[PDB]
Amino acid sequence: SLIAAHSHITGLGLDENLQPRPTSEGMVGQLQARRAAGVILKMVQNGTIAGRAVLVAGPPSTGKTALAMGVSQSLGKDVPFTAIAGSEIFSLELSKTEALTQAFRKSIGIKIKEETELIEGEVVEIQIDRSITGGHKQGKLTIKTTDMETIYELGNKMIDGLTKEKVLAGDVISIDKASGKITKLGRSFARSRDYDAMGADTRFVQCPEGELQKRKTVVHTVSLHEIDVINSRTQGFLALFTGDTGEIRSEVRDQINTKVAEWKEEGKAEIVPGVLFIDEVHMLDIECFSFINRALEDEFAPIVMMATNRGVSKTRGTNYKSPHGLPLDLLDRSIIITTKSYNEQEIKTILSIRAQEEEVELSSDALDLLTKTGVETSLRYSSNLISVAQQIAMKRKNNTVEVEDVKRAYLLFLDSARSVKYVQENESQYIDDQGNVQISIA
Amino acid sequence: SLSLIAAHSHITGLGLDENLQPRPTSEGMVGQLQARRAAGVILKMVQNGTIAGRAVLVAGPPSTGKTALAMGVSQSLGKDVPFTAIAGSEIFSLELSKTEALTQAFRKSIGIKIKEETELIEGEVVEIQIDRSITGGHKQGKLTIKTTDMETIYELGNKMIDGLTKEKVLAGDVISIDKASGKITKLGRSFARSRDYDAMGADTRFVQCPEGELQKRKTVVHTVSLHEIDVINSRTQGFLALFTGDTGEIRSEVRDQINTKVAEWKEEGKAEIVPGVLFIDEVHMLDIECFSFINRALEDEFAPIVMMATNRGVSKTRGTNYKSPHGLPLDLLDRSIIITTKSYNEQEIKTILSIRAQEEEVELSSDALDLLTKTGVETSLRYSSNLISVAQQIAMKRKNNTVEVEDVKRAYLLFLDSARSVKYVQENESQYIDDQGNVQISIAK
Amino acid sequence: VTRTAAHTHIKGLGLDESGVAKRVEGGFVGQIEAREACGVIVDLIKAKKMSGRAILLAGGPSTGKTALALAISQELGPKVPFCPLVGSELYSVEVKKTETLMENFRRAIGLRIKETKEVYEGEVTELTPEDAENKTISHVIVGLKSAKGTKTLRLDPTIYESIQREKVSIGDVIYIEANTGAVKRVGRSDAYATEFDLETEEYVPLPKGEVHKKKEIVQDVTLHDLDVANARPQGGQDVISMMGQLLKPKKTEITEKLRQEVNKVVAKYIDQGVAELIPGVLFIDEVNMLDIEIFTYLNKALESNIAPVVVLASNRGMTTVRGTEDVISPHGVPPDLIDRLLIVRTLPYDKDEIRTIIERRATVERLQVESSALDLLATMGTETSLRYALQLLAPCGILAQTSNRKEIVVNDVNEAKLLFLDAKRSTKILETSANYL
Amino acid sequence: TRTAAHTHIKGLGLDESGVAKRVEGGFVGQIEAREACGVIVDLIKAKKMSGRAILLAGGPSTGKTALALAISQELGPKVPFCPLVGSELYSVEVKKTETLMENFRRAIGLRIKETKEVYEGEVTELTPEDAENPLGGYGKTISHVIVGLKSAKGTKTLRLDPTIYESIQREKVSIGDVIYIEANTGAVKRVGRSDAYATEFDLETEEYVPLPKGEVHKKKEIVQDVTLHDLDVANARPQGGQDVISMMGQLLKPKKTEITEKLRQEVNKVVAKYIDQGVAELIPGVLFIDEVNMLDIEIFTYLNKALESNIAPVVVLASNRGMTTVRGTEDVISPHGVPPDLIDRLLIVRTLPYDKDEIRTIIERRATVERLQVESSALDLLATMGTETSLRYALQLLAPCGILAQTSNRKEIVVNDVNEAKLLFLDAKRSTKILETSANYL
Amino acid sequence: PFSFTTFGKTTSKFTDLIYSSRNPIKYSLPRLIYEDLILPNYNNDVDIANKLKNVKFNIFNPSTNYELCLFLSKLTGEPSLNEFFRVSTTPLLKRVIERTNGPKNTDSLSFKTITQELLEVTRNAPSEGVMASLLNVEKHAYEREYLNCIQRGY
Ligand SMILES: Nc1ncnc2c1ncn2[C@@H]1O[C@H](COP(=O)(O)OP(=O)(O)O)[C@@H](O)[C@H]1O
Ligand SMILES: Nc1ncnc2c1ncn2[C@@H]1O[C@H](COP(=O)(O)OP(=O)(O)O)[C@@H](O)[C@H]1O
Ligand SMILES: Nc1ncnc2c1ncn2[C@@H]1O[C@H](COP(=O)(O)OP(=O)(O)O)[C@@H](O)[C@H]1O
Ligand SMILES: Nc1ncnc2c1ncn2[C@@H]1O[C@H](COP(=O)(O)OP(=O)(O)O)[C@@H](O)[C@H]1O
C-alpha cells in the first residue's frame, strides 16, 4: 500500500505491567497518556463495562490522533473501530441523532457461530431442468470422491452458481453448503474430447480422498448497524453499500435488541464491544452533545474516544464559551487524558523514526538541523521536509540526504510563521478581509 | 404569430455598417455609438469563433439599454447560434446546486452542428403483402406505398416487418420510411379513409395524403448544445429530462467523456463546434460562490462568451459584508472588459419614443410627442413608453384615432410615476403601514 | 340561498360607455379616479395587443384595491382568464420561487378550442368481431339500441380492446364517444333483469333518447394546462386510476425548451384557425411580501412576448425591501422594478360614503337596518374602522333575530359593541393589564 | 484552434538535474515556484507518498493555476488531474463530505492489464447437430452446434457447446451476420450484418459493419485505465438486477447517495489484492482545489481527516487572500483563509509578482499563440498597460485589437488600434473612477 | 403480524379458498362525485379535454411536431419516431415492464459510458478474472459473511 502520516505506529508500546517503554512499537515519549490509553485498552478488552466516554485533550502536534491509532492497532482483530470526524454527523438525509445512533451501532459487534458442511469431489454428471423462460431451475448433481459417490438434489441458487464458473464433468469443485460457495480447484480428467469453444486451462489436480462431506464450524463478525439495515427493508444489503438507509424506525431497533439478547442466551452469538473515535469533537452541535449524554447510558454503548485540541472556546449552536468546546454535563461523564508538548530529544527521535520508515537516509548534521527546525516552528513541518529533501537528493544524484539539501528544501518551501511574515509585509498584494487589493505593479 | 408586442420588440439587431461603425439610428437602436461599437466587436469575436471564455460586463445607470444592447447582439447573431439569456435569480434552486446551475448554463450556451442526409419515402399504404418464411428468418414483404401521383412495390426485411408489427400499421395509414437509416414513423390515417370507420380510435390521427414524388431526398442541419448531450447520456431514457427539467447534477466523468469525444468528432469531421453567448442579466444578484465559479470556469476551451449587465454602483457583494465596485468582486473585474453606457439627451429620447410609437401602431402628434419627450427627460424613459399605450386607449375611448395633448395629459393625471408616488406617500405617512407595523385606519380621531 | 363573502356586493367597475365614472354604480361608491384608471386598463387588456404591462395600486388598508381587482375580473368576463394570487404563495418547498412565478405567468394566458362531442347510447344487441387475418380482428360490427330506435356501427381494433377491457357482453348499456373513443359500461339492460333472481349485474333502464347525440362545446384551457399536460416526470395522465400511482411525482423546473415547443405548437394551431388566444390578468395581492429575488426575476420576465397584464397591490410606505437591509423604497417595491410600473393611487373615505357602503352591505345581505342605527354604525365606523362596522352588521341581525325582530335597532348595535371589541379597545385593555391581557 | 487564456503553458520546462531556464515552455519568470513544482512533480512520479498537501500563495493574476496546469501536463495524460473550484463542494443532493471524498477517489487512477482470446467474423452456417440416441419426449437433442466463421485471410469451423444455442436464438443470429464469441465466457455478440450480405436492397434497417480484419482467432492484451471512483459508483449501483426496482432505478434519475466507508474498504482491499498479483498498477493523481479560502471549517476538518488517511492522493491548494476570516467561523483570523492546523499540515509555495519585461514577454507569447502580429511599439504600449493596469486586462484586450486590425484589413497591430480598444473597453479601475464620480446609481 | 383485516371467516371433492382480505376502514364516496367528475358523461367534458391535452397538443406528436421527433431521433437514436410519443404517454411502471430494446442506431449521440462498458463486461463472466472481480464485490461480501443463513430478526 501507500505510506501515510501515522504509519509508524504498530501498536501502543506497553508492557504487561501497563508500563510504556521510552521507544517501542513506533511510539516514543508521552508516558502518562500512553499508560492511560493502555488502561482504557484493557478496559475495552474486558468488555463487561459499557458506555464510558474518554476525552483525549492537548495542544496540536502532540499525538492525540497518534495515540488513537495506536489504540486501534493494539485493539486486535475482529473488534470494531469506527474512526469518524466531527463533521460526518451533519447530513441531508439523516438526522444528527440518527447518524450518531448509526455510528454507535456500527461500533459494536456480534460474533455469530454457524455450522457448515464441506463437500469436495469430482463431478460425474450434471442434469439441470430449466423452464421454457428460464425462470424455474431445478436439477440433480452427482459428485464423487474415490471412496463413495453420492447424488444431491439442487436448488435454484446452487444451479445459478453452477452456471457461472462453468463446471464440466471431471471438475474437482468444493461446495460450501451454508455460504453457497463454489470453488473449482481444478480439472482432473483432462478429456480427449475437448470443445473448441471453451478456453479454460484449469490446472490438473489430484483426485480427492476421504469422506465426501465434512462438518466445520465457522465464526464471522457483523455489527448491529449491518443487521439493522438488513432487517430494515427487503433490499437492505444493497443499502449497506450505497448508504441509502434513511432513518430506520425504533421498532426495528427494539426487535433486534431482543433478538441479539436471545442469540446471546443460546450460545449462538457473542457480543464484543468496540471503540468509537471522534476526531475534532468540538465541531459537533449542542444537540449532538445532549444525545451523546443520553445515549452513553444504554446497554449497547461503546467506549467513546473523544479528541480535541481546543481550549476554552465557543460551543457551537450556543452563545457562550465552555472548556474544550464541550458543555459541563458531557464533561461530567468524561474522564480526561491530557498530553504534553515535546522536547528536542523526543522530536529528534520522532524524526528518526519517520526517516527510518520513509526509506530516507539522513546524516547526523541534517538530523540535528531537522530537529532544530522542528523544535523551532513545528514537528509536522520537518516531517514534511524529509520528503522534499529526499527528492532533491535524488535529483542531485546522491543516495544520502545532506545539510545543503535540507537547506534548499527549507528555502524552497515555507512554513506558517514565514508565510505570515511575507503576507504582512505585502498586504497590498493579497486580497484583504475587506476585499481590497492592488494588482497593478505601479 | 403567438408573440405579442413587448418592450424590446422594436430591436432587430445592432445598427452597424460593414466597417463596425454604428449609424445614428438603424435597426431600432438609437445612440450609444461607443457601446454599440463595443458590442459589435464582441459580435465579431463571437462570429469568428476562435477565442474561448471571455467575460464582458455591461455597466450603466437604469433605463439606459444594457438589456436592449444584449438582445440587439442576440438579434444580429441570428439563428443556429445558441443564446442563453437568464437572470441571476434562476441560479438558486432546491434540487440543483448553484455551481451546477452555472455549469448547465455554460453548456447550454455552446453547441455543435450535425448534417443529415435523408431519403424519405412518404406515402399512403395500400396493401402489406407478407411473404411468410418457413423457417421464420428473413421474412419478406411487398409494401404497396402510394401517394396521389405514383405507386410502386418494395422489398422488406425481417426487422422492418418487426417494426411495422411493433407499431400497428394497416391499409390506408400514412407512413414514411428512410432508406439509409431505416427509420419508421406513422403519421396517421389518410383523410380518404376517414368514413370507413364510424367511431375513431383513441390514438388515431388524420393526416393528408402526400403530394408529388414518392421518394424524396433532403439534407438537414442539426444544432445540439452540449448540455442536451449531457442530459441524454446521463440516463437510460433521458430525453424526458430535456423537457421536465429534472436533470440532477450530472457527474464530471460524463461531461469529460462528452468533451473528449466531441473533440475527436471534430477531428474526424462529422461535427463543427458553434460557440455562443451566455447573457447573465442582473449579475449582482449572485452569491460569491457563483462569482468564484464564473472566474474559474471561463478558462476551459468549451466556454462561451459571458455577457453580464449591472446597474449597481459601489455596493456590497451578496454573501459577504464589504462593498465593492459594480457589486462584483475584484477578481471578476480583473477578468473583465467593461462596456460603459451613458444616459440620453432629449433628441435620443424623442427618437426612441417615436420608434416605440411606430412599433405599437400608435400615431403620435408632434405636440404630444414633445410632451412625452418632456415627461421622459423629467421622470424616465420607461414611464413615457408606458404612457403611450394608455394614451392611445384613452384616445380610442374618446372616438379618436390619433393622440392629442389632452389624452396624454389625462394619461399623466390618472397614472403616477415613482417620484409623485414618493411625494404623495411622504405627505401622508399615517395612512400607510410603516416599517414598525404601525398604521392609523381611523379616518377621524 | 346564496352565501355572502366580503366582495359579493360589488359586481363591476360601473363605468359608462364614455369612460366617465358614475358616483354610485356597480357596487362601488366614490373612488372615481382609480375606477377610471382601471377602466382604461381593462380596455388595454381587451385590445389584446401588448404584453408585459404592469400596474401597481397604492393606498391605505381598507381602501378598495382588491375590490378594484375583482371589478377588473368581472369586467373582463369569464372568457378572459384571471389568476388572483397572494404574494406569500410563491415561496414553495417543492420548486423554486422564480419557477412558481413563471408558472403563474403561464397560468394567466388562455386558449379557446371549439370541438364537437358526438356520442352513442344504448343496448348491445349484437357484437360480431370480424377477424380477416393477414389472430387479429380487422373490425367489429356493434349494433346499439335505444327507445327511439337502433343503429349499427363499425369499430376499429382499439375500441374492441376497450370493449373487452370494460367486460361488455350482449345486453349491456354502453357509452361510446366517436372522437375520443371512450368506452364506458353503464350496466345491463332492464329487459334482461329476470334471467336470475339475484345477481351482481346493475340493471339500468334503456335510454329514452336517440342513440346518436351530437353537440358542440368550447374548451377553455390555459397555456399552463398544456405545459403540465405534456411534462410529466411519471407519465400516464390519461389512464383513470382511482388509487394513485406508487411514486408521487414532484413539481419540477419546467425548462425553456418545452415552453418554446408548446408555443410553436400553439402558434401552428392558431394559424389553422382552430384555437384562439385570450391573454389574461395575473393579480398579485400584497406584493410587499415578495423577496428581492422574485423582484429580479419579475424584472426579467416582464419583457417576454407572451407575458400577461400584471396587477400588483401594496399598502406600505417607506419600507425596507424584503431580503434587503438598507434599501428603503415606496410600497416595498425596488426602484428598478418601479420604473416599469404604472402606479394608481387609492384614496381613503369619509363618513357619507362609508354610510352608503354600510347600507349597500345591509341591502345585499338582506338585513333591514333602522336609520338611526345606520347613523350610529356610520359614526362607529368613522371612529373605529370600516371593516369593524362591516363585520358587525351580521351579529346585529342575529341579536335582532333572537328577539324575534327583523329590523335592527340601536340596542342591538350597543349590545354587539359591548360583546365584540375592535383592535383599539382590545389594545387599550392589553396595555393596562400585566399578565398577558 | 481555440484559445482559452491558456495552452501557451506546455509543461514546467525544468532542465534535467538542474534549475529551470528563464523563458521556456511558455513560462516567464517564477523561478523558485517552478523549482518547487518540479520537486513536487518528481515526488508524485516517485509513487510513494500519500496525503501530501501543497498550498500556492500569491496575489491575483500571478500564475498559480498556470503552475497547476504545468504540473498536470508534466505528469502526463495517464496521471489523473481533477481541477475543482471551492464552490463545487457545496451540494444540495448529498452532504459536502461525500462530495469531497468522491473527488478524492476520482483523483486516484488505476491501470488494469488483461488478455482476451476472442473469436469473431462473418458466420457461414449454424447447424444444431442432433445427438445419437436422442433421449425421449424431447425433439431437437443437440449434441453440439457447428458455427462456421470467416473473416479476412482466415476461415474457421467451430464445434461449440450445446448451451450456446440459446444465446444464438436469444440475440437473433442468422446466416449473414458477424458475431463475437469469447473463449472463456462463451457469449455471442451480434455486431451486425455484413456489407456483402445486404440482400434486402429496397427496405431494411439492420446495421451494416465491414467484415472484420485479421484472423478469426486473435488473442491480444488490452489495457484499461479507470479511476477508483468509477469502481465505487459501479459497485454501488445495482449491476443488472433483472427485478422491478433495479429497472425502476435505471429508468429514474440517478440520485447521488452517500457511499459508505465499507464499500470503499472492500474496493481498496480487492484493488490491493490484484495489485499483489501484478495484473494492475495504481497511479496516483493530483487534485486541484481553487480558492480554498472559500471552503467552510467543516470541509477543512474533513480535509484533515482525509489527509491523514491511506489512499488519498496529493492535493494542490491555492489561495489569494492574505489575512482573512475562515468561513463558518466568526472570529478566527488565519493566513490565506486556512486554519492553523491545516496550515501546519501543508507546505506553502509563494509566487512573486512580475515585472514590465516579464509582462511584455507574456503578452507577446500569447500573441503568437492567438496568431496575431503586433508592432513592437504596440507591444511596449501593452507592456506599460500591464504595468499601470492589471495583467489580465492587457491580456484580454488583444482579441479586440485583432478584430479592429482585421476591420482595417491589416494583419499588424498598430498603436491607434490599441488606443481605440482602450477607449472602447474601460478598465476595472477606470470604471471604479467613473463609479465614484457619477451620482446616478451607475 | 397482526392481520388488520376483515375477511370471510368460518363460524363453524374440494373446498375452494378465495382471497378476501379487506381493510376494516371503509372510505365512502357518493355516486355523484364518481359519475360526475371521474367517469365520462354527455354533460361531462373529461374525455374531450383529456384527448385535447394528451394527443392533440402533445409536443411529441409526429403529425404536427415532426421536426422535434426527428431531432430527438438523431440524439437518442431510436429506430422508430413514435417511440417518444409512446414513452411520454405511458404509466412509468408499465414503461418499466415493457422495456426490452436492443437495436439502436450507431450514428447517434447516445453513448456507451465507461461504467456501461464495465457493466456489459460483467453481464456474464466467471471468477479468476481481474475485470470482473474488481466489480463483483457485493457478491463477495455476501458469500464471505455466511449471510444466506442469518435468521430473521424483525
Ligand atoms: N508519541 C508519538 N509517537 C508517534 N508519533 C507521534 C507521537 N506524538 C506525535 N506524533 C506525530 O505527530 C503528529 C501529530 O499528531 P496527531 O495527534 O496526528 O495531531 P495532533 O497532535 O495535532 O492532534 C502525527 O503525525 C504523529 O505521527
Ligand atoms: N439603444 C436603444 N435604442 C432604442 N431603445 C432603447 C435603447 N436603449 C434603451 N432603450 C429603451 O429602454 C427601455 C428598456 O431599457 P433597458 O434595457 O431596460 O435599460 P437598462 O439596460 O438600463 O435596464 C426599452 O423600452 C427600450 O425601448
Ligand atoms: N369604493 C367602494 N365601494 C364599495 N365598497 C368598497 C369600496 N372600497 C372598498 N369597499 C369595500 O371594502 C371592503 C374591503 O376592501 P379591501 O379591498 O379589502 O381593502 P384593501 O384595498 O385595503 O384590500 C371590500 O369588501 C369592499 O366591498
Ligand atoms: N509565468 C507565466 N508565464 C506565462 N504566462 C503566465 C505566467 N503567469 C501567469 N500567466 C498568464 O496570466 C494569465 C492569468 O494568470 P492566472 O494563472 O489566471 O493567475 P492566477 O494564478 O491568479 O489564477 C493566464 O493566462 C496565464 O497564462
mmCIF file of C-alpha atoms in Angstrom, chain B residues 1-9 62-63 67 71 79 85-96 108 130 170 196-204 228 240 242-246 281-282 284-285 311-312 316 318 323 356 360-361 380 382-383 385-387 389-390 393-394 396-397 399 410 413-418 421-422 424-429 431-435 439 441-444, chain C residues 16-19 33 36-37 40-41 43-44 47-51 53 58-62 93 95-96 98 120 138-139 152-156 158-159 176 178-181 231-233 250 252-255 257-258 261 263 266-267 270 277 292-293 296-297 299-300 303-306 315-320 325 330-331 336 338-340 342-345 348-351 354 382-385 424:
data_model
loop_
_atom_site.group_PDB
_atom_site.id
_atom_site.type_symbol
_atom_site.label_atom_id
_atom_site.label_comp_id
_atom_site.label_asym_id
_atom_site.label_seq_id
_atom_site.Cartn_x
_atom_site.Cartn_y
_atom_site.Cartn_z
ATOM 1 C CA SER B 1 -47.625 34.563 -34.607
ATOM 2 C CA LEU B 2 -48.064 33.844 -30.908
ATOM 3 C CA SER B 3 -45.647 36.600 -29.890
ATOM 4 C CA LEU B 4 -47.091 39.994 -28.971
ATOM 5 C CA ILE B 5 -45.621 43.482 -28.788
ATOM 6 C CA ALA B 6 -43.078 43.659 -25.959
ATOM 7 C CA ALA B 7 -40.965 46.500 -24.605
ATOM 8 C CA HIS B 8 -37.992 45.333 -26.693
ATOM 9 C CA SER B 9 -39.752 44.233 -29.875
ATOM 10 C CA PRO B 62 -31.080 52.254 -15.119
ATOM 11 C CA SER B 63 -33.161 52.812 -18.283
ATOM 12 C CA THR B 67 -30.603 44.643 -21.830
ATOM 13 C CA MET B 71 -30.830 41.419 -27.153
ATOM 14 C CA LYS B 79 -30.465 31.613 -35.575
ATOM 15 C CA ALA B 85 -30.488 34.924 -21.510
ATOM 16 C CA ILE B 86 -31.095 34.119 -17.834
ATOM 17 C CA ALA B 87 -31.413 36.280 -14.746
ATOM 18 C CA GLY B 88 -29.294 35.814 -11.635
ATOM 19 C CA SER B 89 -32.359 34.636 -9.725
ATOM 20 C CA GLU B 90 -32.683 31.447 -11.787
ATOM 21 C CA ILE B 91 -29.455 30.058 -10.300
ATOM 22 C CA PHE B 92 -30.752 29.476 -6.754
ATOM 23 C CA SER B 93 -32.531 26.125 -6.967
ATOM 24 C CA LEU B 94 -33.534 23.483 -4.457
ATOM 25 C CA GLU B 95 -32.550 20.179 -6.091
ATOM 26 C CA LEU B 96 -29.612 21.568 -8.110
ATOM 27 C CA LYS B 108 -26.469 25.356 -22.746
ATOM 28 C CA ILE B 130 -46.298 -10.610 -46.319
ATOM 29 C CA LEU B 170 -52.735 -1.121 -41.629
ATOM 30 C CA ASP B 196 -64.849 3.645 -43.309
ATOM 31 C CA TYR B 197 -64.992 3.525 -39.503
ATOM 32 C CA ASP B 198 -67.903 5.056 -37.632
ATOM 33 C CA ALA B 199 -66.124 5.777 -34.325
ATOM 34 C CA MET B 200 -62.464 6.760 -34.250
ATOM 35 C CA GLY B 201 -59.721 5.252 -32.126
ATOM 36 C CA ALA B 202 -58.102 6.722 -29.052
ATOM 37 C CA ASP B 203 -54.752 7.336 -30.770
ATOM 38 C CA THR B 204 -55.895 7.515 -34.410
ATOM 39 C CA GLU B 228 -28.508 18.273 -24.264
ATOM 40 C CA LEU B 240 -37.778 13.343 -20.979
ATOM 41 C CA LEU B 242 -34.671 17.660 -21.573
ATOM 42 C CA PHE B 243 -38.265 18.821 -21.023
ATOM 43 C CA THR B 244 -39.273 18.140 -17.410
ATOM 44 C CA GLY B 245 -36.060 19.775 -16.194
ATOM 45 C CA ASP B 246 -35.174 17.003 -13.732
ATOM 46 C CA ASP B 281 -28.735 39.526 -16.636
ATOM 47 C CA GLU B 282 -28.547 41.190 -13.183
ATOM 48 C CA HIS B 284 -25.164 41.479 -8.902
ATOM 49 C CA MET B 285 -27.912 39.145 -7.645
ATOM 50 C CA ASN B 311 -26.906 48.854 -12.779
ATOM 51 C CA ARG B 312 -25.368 48.712 -9.296
ATOM 52 C CA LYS B 316 -21.977 45.184 -1.129
ATOM 53 C CA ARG B 318 -24.009 39.184 -1.723
ATOM 54 C CA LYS B 323 -18.672 46.910 -0.553
ATOM 55 C CA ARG B 356 -41.819 52.697 -29.789
ATOM 56 C CA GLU B 360 -47.190 49.703 -31.174
ATOM 57 C CA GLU B 361 -49.100 51.270 -34.154
ATOM 58 C CA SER B 380 -37.746 58.364 -17.005
ATOM 59 C CA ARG B 382 -39.934 53.813 -19.471
ATOM 60 C CA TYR B 383 -42.733 55.785 -17.798
ATOM 61 C CA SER B 385 -43.169 54.488 -23.107
ATOM 62 C CA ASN B 386 -45.809 53.000 -20.826
ATOM 63 C CA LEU B 387 -47.818 56.229 -21.063
ATOM 64 C CA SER B 389 -50.300 52.891 -24.909
ATOM 65 C CA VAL B 390 -52.706 54.080 -22.217
ATOM 66 C CA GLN B 393 -56.613 53.678 -25.227
ATOM 67 C CA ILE B 394 -57.847 56.970 -23.749
ATOM 68 C CA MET B 396 -59.822 55.425 -28.601
ATOM 69 C CA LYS B 397 -62.350 55.760 -25.775
ATOM 70 C CA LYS B 399 -63.660 58.088 -30.517
ATOM 71 C CA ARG B 410 -55.277 62.703 -18.872
ATOM 72 C CA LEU B 413 -53.145 62.578 -14.460
ATOM 73 C CA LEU B 414 -54.591 59.080 -13.993
ATOM 74 C CA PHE B 415 -51.291 57.183 -13.688
ATOM 75 C CA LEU B 416 -48.443 58.209 -11.392
ATOM 76 C CA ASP B 417 -44.686 57.835 -11.707
ATOM 77 C CA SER B 418 -42.230 56.942 -8.946
ATOM 78 C CA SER B 421 -45.897 58.436 -5.612
ATOM 79 C CA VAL B 422 -42.946 59.054 -3.265
ATOM 80 C CA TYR B 424 -47.706 61.505 -2.195
ATOM 81 C CA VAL B 425 -46.792 58.891 0.416
ATOM 82 C CA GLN B 426 -44.279 61.141 2.204
ATOM 83 C CA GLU B 427 -47.043 63.719 2.594
ATOM 84 C CA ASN B 428 -49.405 61.221 4.308
ATOM 85 C CA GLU B 429 -47.464 58.634 6.311
ATOM 86 C CA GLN B 431 -52.434 56.136 6.335
ATOM 87 C CA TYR B 432 -49.768 53.692 5.176
ATOM 88 C CA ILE B 433 -48.227 50.801 7.084
ATOM 89 C CA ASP B 434 -44.860 51.836 8.494
ATOM 90 C CA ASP B 435 -41.674 49.816 8.883
ATOM 91 C CA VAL B 439 -50.947 52.407 10.912
ATOM 92 C CA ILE B 441 -57.037 53.179 9.830
ATOM 93 C CA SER B 442 -59.476 55.525 11.544
ATOM 94 C CA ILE B 443 -60.380 58.432 9.281
ATOM 95 C CA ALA B 444 -61.232 60.670 12.257
ATOM 96 C CA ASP C 16 -70.154 54.462 -18.560
ATOM 97 C CA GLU C 17 -69.627 53.849 -22.259
ATOM 98 C CA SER C 18 -67.839 57.212 -22.453
ATOM 99 C CA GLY C 19 -65.258 56.260 -19.815
ATOM 100 C CA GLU C 33 -60.259 58.234 -10.463
ATOM 101 C CA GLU C 36 -61.468 55.241 -14.485
ATOM 102 C CA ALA C 37 -57.802 54.185 -14.438
ATOM 103 C CA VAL C 40 -58.507 52.282 -19.219
ATOM 104 C CA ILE C 41 -56.534 49.211 -18.092
ATOM 105 C CA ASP C 43 -59.672 48.447 -22.371
ATOM 106 C CA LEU C 44 -55.941 47.795 -22.806
ATOM 107 C CA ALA C 47 -57.239 45.331 -27.041
ATOM 108 C CA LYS C 48 -55.277 42.012 -26.981
ATOM 109 C CA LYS C 49 -52.114 43.627 -28.343
ATOM 110 C CA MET C 50 -49.424 44.324 -25.730
ATOM 111 C CA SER C 51 -47.504 42.017 -23.400
ATOM 112 C CA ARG C 53 -47.873 45.546 -18.863
ATOM 113 C CA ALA C 58 -51.180 52.256 -3.966
ATOM 114 C CA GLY C 59 -53.283 53.199 -0.973
ATOM 115 C CA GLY C 60 -54.056 52.540 2.639
ATOM 116 C CA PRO C 61 -55.652 49.430 4.106
ATOM 117 C CA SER C 62 -59.433 49.107 3.586
ATOM 118 C CA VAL C 93 -40.766 23.857 -0.760
ATOM 119 C CA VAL C 95 -39.900 24.029 -6.618
ATOM 120 C CA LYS C 96 -38.015 27.328 -6.594
ATOM 121 C CA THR C 98 -39.000 32.032 -9.655
ATOM 122 C CA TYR C 120 -73.638 6.715 -28.916
ATOM 123 C CA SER C 138 -59.829 -6.350 -38.598
ATOM 124 C CA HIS C 139 -63.027 -4.722 -37.314
ATOM 125 C CA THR C 152 -75.256 -0.169 -36.270
ATOM 126 C CA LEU C 153 -71.618 0.914 -36.003
ATOM 127 C CA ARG C 154 -68.287 -0.189 -37.450
ATOM 128 C CA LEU C 155 -65.428 -0.042 -34.959
ATOM 129 C CA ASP C 156 -61.641 -0.417 -35.040
ATOM 130 C CA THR C 158 -58.716 -0.340 -30.326
ATOM 131 C CA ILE C 159 -62.373 0.276 -29.459
ATOM 132 C CA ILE C 176 -69.133 5.399 -26.939
ATOM 133 C CA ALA C 178 -66.791 8.939 -31.541
ATOM 134 C CA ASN C 179 -63.907 11.411 -31.384
ATOM 135 C CA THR C 180 -62.144 10.401 -28.163
ATOM 136 C CA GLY C 181 -63.067 6.719 -28.179
ATOM 137 C CA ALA C 231 -44.326 17.438 -18.940
ATOM 138 C CA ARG C 232 -44.891 14.549 -16.544
ATOM 139 C CA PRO C 233 -41.917 13.100 -14.614
ATOM 140 C CA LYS C 250 -42.752 16.109 -7.607
ATOM 141 C CA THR C 252 -40.126 20.271 -11.286
ATOM 142 C CA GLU C 253 -38.427 23.191 -13.021
ATOM 143 C CA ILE C 254 -40.025 23.239 -16.468
ATOM 144 C CA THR C 255 -37.338 24.242 -18.956
ATOM 145 C CA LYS C 257 -37.281 24.314 -24.365
ATOM 146 C CA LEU C 258 -40.716 22.919 -23.510
ATOM 147 C CA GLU C 261 -42.095 23.910 -28.265
ATOM 148 C CA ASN C 263 -45.508 27.988 -28.136
ATOM 149 C CA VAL C 266 -49.974 26.592 -30.204
ATOM 150 C CA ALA C 267 -48.965 29.004 -32.978
ATOM 151 C CA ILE C 270 -53.822 29.198 -34.160
ATOM 152 C CA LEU C 277 -55.556 33.234 -27.916
ATOM 153 C CA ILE C 292 -35.858 40.647 -3.861
ATOM 154 C CA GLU C 293 -35.022 37.542 -5.938
ATOM 155 C CA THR C 296 -35.278 40.413 -10.056
ATOM 156 C CA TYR C 297 -36.960 37.549 -11.919
ATOM 157 C CA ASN C 299 -37.771 42.420 -13.845
ATOM 158 C CA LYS C 300 -36.504 39.822 -16.314
ATOM 159 C CA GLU C 303 -40.053 41.633 -21.119
ATOM 160 C CA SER C 304 -41.351 38.408 -22.686
ATOM 161 C CA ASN C 305 -43.561 38.324 -25.776
ATOM 162 C CA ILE C 306 -46.352 36.283 -24.158
ATOM 163 C CA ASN C 315 -50.149 49.411 1.198
ATOM 164 C CA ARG C 316 -46.769 50.124 2.784
ATOM 165 C CA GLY C 317 -44.925 53.438 2.863
ATOM 166 C CA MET C 318 -41.175 53.920 3.098
ATOM 167 C CA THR C 319 -40.336 50.298 3.839
ATOM 168 C CA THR C 320 -37.286 48.081 3.643
ATOM 169 C CA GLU C 325 -31.119 45.510 4.854
ATOM 170 C CA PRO C 330 -42.021 53.185 -1.734
ATOM 171 C CA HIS C 331 -44.530 50.355 -1.200
ATOM 172 C CA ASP C 336 -35.560 49.282 -10.743
ATOM 173 C CA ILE C 338 -40.921 50.604 -10.143
ATOM 174 C CA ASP C 339 -39.744 52.205 -13.393
ATOM 175 C CA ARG C 340 -41.740 49.624 -15.358
ATOM 176 C CA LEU C 342 -47.787 52.448 -13.527
ATOM 177 C CA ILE C 343 -48.847 53.470 -10.036
ATOM 178 C CA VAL C 344 -52.514 54.310 -9.438
ATOM 179 C CA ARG C 345 -53.291 55.880 -6.063
ATOM 180 C CA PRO C 348 -59.408 56.861 1.921
ATOM 181 C CA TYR C 349 -63.068 57.533 2.691
ATOM 182 C CA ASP C 350 -65.232 59.878 4.753
ATOM 183 C CA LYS C 351 -68.475 59.458 6.664
ATOM 184 C CA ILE C 354 -68.905 54.885 4.481
ATOM 185 C CA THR C 382 -65.588 56.507 11.312
ATOM 186 C CA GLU C 383 -64.341 56.134 14.883
ATOM 187 C CA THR C 384 -63.051 52.540 14.989
ATOM 188 C CA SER C 385 -62.584 51.407 11.336
ATOM 189 C CA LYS C 424 -58.050 49.773 19.604
#
